[PDB]
């Protein structure tokens, strides 16, 4: 009987924890987008026909 | 006869010392059920989801 409520309670930790674990990579994702796009950006400013304003 | 009566005490004796054992039971049985919720919102806190207010 106590371990019965205990899986109960591990279940619902582990949800916890798969919970915790999807928003923090769901927020990674943007991360890695805004590094991509960074990365497209520092290649175009490489080019030699860039002039400082550009 | 006189032992007759002996044994009609024993068994009233018995009866209510069988009564004892049950209410001791019975609010036994509330103890076991405290302690089983006890255990399981302590196995909730364990998990690291939870902040310091939860």
């Given at each position: 009987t106590?371990?019965?409520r205990?899986?109960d309670?591990?279940?619902?930790?582990?949800n916890?924890?798969?919970?915790?674990?999807?928003?923090?990579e769901?927020?990674?994702?943007?991360?890695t987008?805004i590094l991509?796009?960074?990365r497209?950006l520092?290649?175009?400013?490489?080019?030699?026909?860039?002039?400082?304003?550009e």
């Amino acid at each position: 009987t106590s371990q019965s409520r205990g899986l109960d309670m591990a279940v619902k930790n582990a949800n916890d924890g798969i919970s915790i674990a999807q928003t923090a990579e769901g927020a990674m994702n943007e991360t890695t987008n805004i590094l991509q796009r960074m990365r497209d950006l520092a290649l175009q400013s490489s080019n030699g026909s860039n002039s400082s304003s550009e």
